[PDB]
Design a protein around this ligand. Structure first.
Ligand code: NA
Ligand code: NA
Ligand code: NA
Lengths: 250, 245, 258, 256
């Protein structure tokens, strides 16, 4: 048997607002493997849900920070440093675009909505990576979540596609800049996890003839963060039941 | 011989500040093929510079607009509509990142610098495409300029790499949204116009600005009527190489 | 207006058997631009067919060679040297897979069928490039045809997809090796066009209809759109472009299946 | 802690001739995780070599087959069926190109040499996948090896690059065809590792030097790193992943 033992390792998991988060899936696997987890939450009004998520994980530390606020990120990382002493893993599961941007056409995206989507969904990785850098230990890593709309047109994903392209390019640059410290940076491109017509359409065309599960994403994040992935950096790894390899729908 | 005659066609070229640039090179080829050209310029203090460019093209209408200002973009397109009645081609040659962002490391990029780079270098394509849409005639097109750092890490290109990744994704989505009107949207990924590029590139030389101009002309012309959503590399083959020579 | 004038230029166009073909479309644009054309034909039994093609182009020189026979390729290129003195352009429009391999599943492909498909559809480019090399003038080039199935799974395209993957990789290596002489090598990735070659692909009517409905332009491309890209790539207007796979597919390949 | 327990699982590992190989590294991680391994070997004169590999793994069944011989592959799979009943994993670590093809220029590759390289390095995956199909149990998988030269020009990788391009396209089509049975197919794109196979690639040494100098991690990868990725991909931890080319290269291929 192979064992993955992450006892003594420290993870910060950002962007989790409910148990269906792919981020929650990864945090759950990290806990199961033995790591200690800190969860960020956006604002004090959301602390109750954050407390519920921490209890759902069997225990986690909470910190308040809005990723648009540089001081609040500074305070978060000061808190992490004091509580953990250092960091091994950062899970970035932050994704946001204004509802108005996601309705209608990409060409019609308003300036402030476009910039906020990019700020929250892409720049946030840079902002947290920079602050994590002095805390991250050798062998440590950052993982983010993406979707294949970065490369292929998925109508109505709109500015989020563009944010994901910016996020994936960021992963590559950050991998180059963090690599000398022995810190790796990767993205997981996930398929949908079970509206119903969309899930069924994906399932008919995917090679595996089904949708992926939350646990499948969790397992890939565990692997990438673990020492089993020590040679892998700068990569976008697809967990999508093979869907994106298809050149037409079935 | 085959001839491409773009007489009667109307181009707006944006982002051009100098005769030795890729946007200028495209504008010049559009003129040579017979098109009329309007150039944008960013601020009225640059009017003299714009005038010298227009003269170097043998004549070009000039319109002031800073692409971060929606009201100014509205005014520009109202002006183009008034002058031309409609539009055939839009050349987006706008690229900017703050000096501080381009010094040092990408991970150290400041928030406002990052956003400004993305706003000017990528969002501007969306802002101008939306305003061009109702003016653009069947057969019309938009072309923008990019660089292979969108896909590969080029140290010191920093946030501009990320902006180009956003720009190329924008090209794909805009191609999808403008396709029903018979309007095409493409990107040209150019090499530099150094000795290391020449040593590694298959052609063992750098590309010229005229080579970029010719590709832009081809993409906007009817010869390219089946091509949309593409990133076409004009780089002497450099980017196909899996290591430096 | 821009003019494209290729008078005095010499083209060898290979793999063409019908006027409704991408290879013929490229040859037609080359002739229209002013170049002289040579067409290969596979065996003396197909000479009549080749003669009609030469006539449809308003005049072309013919040479016999089967692309699986190295000695016949040596003979064809000796003939080209004697008749033209040198060569500017080579259009590689050769594609073939046995119909036994094209029906059913890729995993069921027979050994000899797979090898022949790769031999005719990918190795042929290497074979002809090597022999064209000493004849190819500075500014010259080679263009081949490919399809999106090389990159993404298109049901029923089977071993032809794998052949096209091999062909595209060959384009990059050949661009690297021929570039220092000023010779360019590129592939055109065409969308579906009703040609006589399309009848040998079991996936066609279904993809052709899908493309019209899914592609950004909301239509299929035409053979003339392919000919025009071929003309551009071979012309001096594309002098900075080499090692590329350029798509002329109405934007189909950029789409997600939503 | 989490545990990957492959007890009761059965692997067939093909192309392995030396402990210093990526194929061997994957076989070793499979053994560590609890799977039983069978190794193929090409020719009976190589039986002693194969026996030493089996002992280095702590035990493996051995089967003779040359992947260019359809009859031999039929006999191999009959032997595997009789021994194991079924199969869970197939590791395709077969690669070959004639020396003459690998020396000098790609453009100068001779016809028979080119075809043999494609036959052994790419068609073999199809040949073995077809025969494995009826044996492979739900949750099962096939993994193969590739490298960046398939996508970008690495001088003097020549026909091996083209064969790897053919192999990666084959992975995608096979994933599509085997997926409805619940069988996954993936490729590992390894950085340069000093293996026995590395000796037959003239372009290897320039790449090996370049990776350590310029990759994000500023080092080359190890065969164990490839072994761990192969183990992950075959394991149930990767149950959502199919038709992929996953890079384990210290980030090299992302660099400009
Ligand atoms: Na909107
Ligand atoms: Na800076
Ligand atoms: Na050789």
């Amino acid at each position: 048997m192979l064992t993955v033992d992450l006892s003594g390792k420290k993870a910060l998991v950002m962007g989790v607002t409910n148990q269906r988060s792919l981020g929650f899936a990864i945090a759950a696997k990290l806990k199961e493997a033995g790591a200690e987890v800190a969860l960020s939450y956006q604002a004090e009004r959301l602390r109750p849900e954050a407390e519920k998520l921490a209890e759902a994980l069997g225990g986690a530390l909470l910190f308040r920070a809005d990723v648009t606020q540089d001081e609040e990120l500074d305070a978060l990382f000061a808190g992490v440093k004091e509580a953990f002493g250092g960091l091994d893993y950062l899970v970035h599961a932050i994704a946001f675009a204004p509802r108005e941007a996601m309705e209608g056409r990409y060409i019609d995206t308003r300036r402030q909505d476009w910039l906020l989507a990019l700020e929250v969904s892409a720049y946030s990785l840079v902002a947290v990576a920079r602050r994590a850098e002095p805390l991250l230990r050798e062998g440590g890593g950052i993982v983010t979540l993406t979707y294949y709309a970065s490369e292929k047109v998925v109508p109505k994903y709109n500015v989020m596609a563009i944010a994901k392209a910016a996020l994936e390019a960021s992963v590559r640059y950050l991998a180059y800049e963090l690599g000398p410290k022995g810190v790796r940076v990767n993205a997981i491109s996930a398929g949908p996890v079970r509206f119903t017509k969309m899930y069924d359409r994906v399932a008919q065309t995917a090679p595996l003839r089904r949708n992926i599960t939350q646990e499948e994403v969790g397992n890939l994040g565990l692997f990438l963060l673990s020492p089993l992935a020590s040679g892998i950096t700068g990569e976008v790894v697809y967990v999508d039941a093979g869907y994106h390899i298809m050149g037409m729908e079935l």
